[PDB]
């Protein structure tokens, strides 16, 4: 548990002892007390009677004589009396995690009222032993050790190839910590497993075991929890939502001493074995999750997939009451929670087993059906991709040949491998999409025909088409938004996470009908054999992906007519179409800019912008004011540079903010022109200072998209809205700076 294990040898074989606090005598693993003769026989309430012995053993090299009983466990429960010299000391591993930055981060983003928010800040301390304090820290689970030695024909040992030495230092720490905790034991074995290193965003590296050779031997003989699909159907979305990431829980379940040889691996010419369940093993996710489910059975609403846990209660007070009940269970069992990726008491959770963020109160996940806009292609190869993409809608769209005709005429126009794109063509393309958004082309779902799903993906997002098996029109298209982590995935994994998000909505439309999925992938079996270093997603992703093949209701077919969508341009995402109230934003930024006639005839101009930071959470208040002269520039430039300053100051505040411009051109450009100027490369603006200002705004929004931009004329507004009052102050500051000369 929280006490550091102590190295000890009893009968030649090394073992570990744990300082106990109970007054009961020392327990010893059962396999050593068979040969020994019993002194007497006593019964224990917490009544079964067991034999009593008196054996000698070494603790840290010093022999110890004590009256002992048996223990079904693999550790030596050490009575404090028998060892008066040795004192209890807490566990001390290598690296201490930044636990205070984690808790302050969770307290910041919590959507709970300040009343319950202080209860949580108190719950950090009462259950301090529950959170993960050390890196690679694991907990002990007082459970009957698992037997994973199923199957009479053992697998063949794999030779260990040299690995990257740049990863050895960061991994040897983990080897030391697990050895220190007894998670790893030095022991030769018949089986050997390859080990692979993969980098971590912080610069260090984590090791990966290749257990697919042992999994082909071990048969599937365990009760599987509801899979990704079955869990997501029974969920209950209430007011607040909370997710708790465990610290590799399979490292908490110990395996039987007989099964240690199976999990063996070679590190630095030395062979080690696993005391606990290892990650990448066949039955580790199932054996671990089942235990977790029983504990969470008592809670009214819960869902557990792998490490992640889900809790959603509508009552603010009851969410915290159940949350404390969750913590006691996890602390009493010996589980360890990582506050690095945990999310507590938020209106939406970023990840709940599935990659989709969960908002609202809906038992079934909802997502936008309609396809999204596409940025103009920069090259011919990116324009040929989108044409062969729309080729499917020829057989059921009347105006198709008429609305696509202009784009065909544009390709042969230049004939110089460079293509010129007109702004109206961008609007024409937007019309092509709106035709698909119209429910005419949308066929109706038929409960008789099976559900056909055609899946392809672009570097920016995926494209999913739900069909009827005979129908020429699709029931409904589906376009999934890639998260910042999924964009890092390889192209093959972008398809798989796309299919994952597509089979979710298919369950709603299945209605007891088998589902056939067509995909550019030729063989599903070959995909499981895809090499490991090419997978750039978490194993939780692949397990979640592979668990869907086993369903006989779903079948996957290779489709040749699916085109290549690697050169598909970026999907146009609009953060301005949703409008949010100014009170819910954490920060409000009013901007403005003026430019009177310069006194000097040479400059001929003078500018001055104004910035106001306002917060509406408690009442209408202003944090700071700013009034800056900009020299000879455009009045709109003063209104252009006014938001570049405001965009930066929002980065220091992690939360929803809103910037407001008196200018029409600024807000409209940030909504439609900015997604263009990014891909446009700022071509044919405007000399160089003008372009640098727009890029800086684009990059600032790239680092934090939580920034929304509105626009309000505010011409002689007596008291139109409570919002225009703050903008009247910003225009005052912009005017003051415009009147000041250097
Ligand atoms: Ca202005």
TrEMBL record:
| Peptidase A9 domain sequence ranges | 1-136
* Binding site residues for Ca(2+): 592-593, 639
- Where does this polypeptide localize? Host cytoplasm; Host nucleus; Virion
Q: Which cofactor does it need?
A: Mg(2+)
Q: Name one GO cellular component term.
A: host cell cytoplasm
Q: Which residues form the RNase H type-1 domain?
A: 583-739
Is Membrane given among the entry's keywords? no
Top-rank taxon: Viruses
Give GO MF terms, alphabetically. aspartic-type endopeptidase activity; DNA-directed DNA polymerase activity; metal ion binding; RNA binding; RNA-directed DNA polymerase activity; RNA-DNA hybrid ribonuclease activity
* Keywords assigned: Aspartyl protease, Calcium, DNA integration, DNA recombination, DNA-directed DNA polymerase, Endonuclease, Host cytoplasm, Host nucleus, Hydrolase, Magnesium, Metal-binding, Multifunctional enzyme, Nuclease, Nucleotidyltransferase, Protease, RNA-binding, RNA-directed DNA polymerase, Transferase, Viral genome integration, Viral penetration into host nucleus, Virion, Virus entry into host cell
Domain Reverse transcriptase, by residue range, is: 179-356
This chain belongs to the protein called: Pro-Pol polyprotein
Q: Which gene name belongs to this protein? A: gag
Entire protein: shown range: 5 to 751 of 1143
């Amino acid at each position: 548990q929280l006490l550091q294990p102590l190295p000890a040898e009893i009968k030649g074989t090394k073992l570990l002892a744990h300082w106990a606090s109970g007054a009961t005598i020392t327990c010893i693993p059962e396999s050593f007390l068979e040969d020994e003769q019993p002194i007497k026989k006593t019964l224990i309430k917490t009544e079964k009677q067991q034999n009593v012995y008196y054996v000698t053993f070494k603790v840290k090299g010093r022999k110890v004589e004590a009256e002992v009983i048996a223990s079904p466990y693999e550790y030596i429960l050490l009575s404090p009396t028998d060892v008066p010299w040795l004192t209890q000391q807490p566990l001390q591993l290598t690296i201490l995690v930044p636990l205070q930055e984690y808790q302050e981060k969770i307290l910041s983003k919590t959507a709970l009222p300040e009343d319950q928010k202080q209860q949580l800040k108190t719950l950090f301390v009462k259950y301090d032993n529950l959170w993960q304090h050390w890196e690679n820290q694991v907990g002990h689970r007082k459970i009957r050790p698992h037997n994973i030695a199923t199957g009479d024909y053992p697998p063949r040992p794999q030779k260990q190839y040299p690995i990257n030495p740049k990863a050895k230092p960061s991994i040897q720490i983990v080897i030391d910590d697990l050895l220190k905790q007894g998670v790893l034991t030095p022991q030769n074995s018949t089986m050997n497993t390859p080990v692979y290193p993969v980098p971590k965003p912080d610069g260090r590296w984590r090791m990966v075991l290749d257990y697919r050779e042992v999994n082909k031997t071990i048969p599937l003989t365990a009760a599987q929890n509801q899979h990704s699909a079955g869990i997501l159907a029974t969920i209950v979305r209430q007011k607040y939502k909370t997710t708790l990431d465990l610290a590799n829980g399979f490292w908490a379940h110990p395996i039987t001493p007989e099964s240690y040889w199976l999990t063996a691996f070679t590190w630095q010419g030395k062979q080690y074995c696993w005391t606990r369940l290892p990650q990448g093993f066949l039955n580790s996710p199932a054996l671990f999750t089942a235990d977790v489910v029983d504990l969470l059975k008592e809670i009214p609403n819960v869902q557990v997939y792998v490490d992640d846990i889900y809790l959603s209660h509508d009552d603010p007070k009851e969410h915290v009451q159940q949350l404390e009940k969750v913590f006691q269970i996890l602390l009493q069992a010996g589980y360890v929670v990582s506050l690095k990726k945990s999310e507590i008491g938020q209106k939406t959770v970023e990840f709940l087993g599935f990659n989709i963020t969960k908002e609202g109160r809906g038992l079934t996940d909802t997502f936008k059906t309609k396809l999204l806009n596409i940025t103009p292609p920069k090259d011919l190869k990116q324009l040929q991709s989108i044409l062969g993409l729309l080729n499917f809608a020829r057989n059921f769209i009347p105006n198709f040949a008429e609305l696509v005709q202009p784009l065909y005429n544009l390709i042969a126009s230049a004939k110089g491998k460079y293509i010129e794109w007109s702004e109206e063509n961008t609007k024409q393309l937007n019309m092509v999409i709106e035709a698909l958004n119209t429910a005419s082309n949308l066929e109706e779902r038929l409960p008789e025909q099976r559900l056909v799903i055609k899946v392809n993906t672009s570097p920016s997002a995926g494209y999913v088409r739900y069909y009827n098996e005979t129908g020429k029109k699709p029931i409904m298209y589906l376009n999934y938004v890639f998260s910042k982590a999924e964009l890092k995935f390889s192209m093959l994994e972008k398809l798989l996470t796309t299919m994952h998000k597509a089979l979710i909505k298919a369950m709603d439309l299945a209605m007891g009908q088998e589902i056939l999925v067509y995909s550019p992938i030729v063989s599903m079996t070959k995909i499981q054999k895809t090499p490991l270093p090419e997978r750039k997603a978490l194993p939780i992703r692949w397990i979640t992906w592979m668990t869907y093949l086993e369903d006989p209701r779903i079948q996957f077919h290779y489709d040749k007519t699916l085109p290549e969508l690697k050169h598909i341009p970026d999907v146009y995402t609009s953060s301005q179409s949703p409008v949010k109230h100014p009170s819910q934003y954490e920060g409000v930024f009013y901007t403005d800019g003026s430019a009177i006639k310069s006194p000097d005839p040479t400059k001929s101009n003078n500018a001055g912008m104004g910035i106001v930071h306002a917060t509406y959470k408690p009442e209408y208040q202003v944090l700071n004011q700013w009034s800056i002269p900009l020299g000879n520039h455009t009045a709109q430039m003063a209104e252009i540079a006014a938001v570049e300053f405001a965009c930066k100051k929002a980065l220091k505040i992690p939360g929803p903010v809103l910037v407001i411009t008196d200018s029409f051109y600024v807000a409209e450009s940030a909504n439609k022109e900015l997604p263009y100027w990014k891909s446009n490369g700022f071509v044919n603006n405007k000399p160089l200072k003008h372009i640098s200002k727009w890029k800086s705004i684009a990059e600032c929004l790239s680092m934090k998209p939580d920034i929304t931009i509105q626009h309000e004329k505010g011409h002689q507004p007596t008291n139109t809205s409570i919002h225009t009052e703050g903008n009247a102050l910003a225009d005052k500051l912009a005017t003051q700076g415009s009147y000041v000369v250097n």
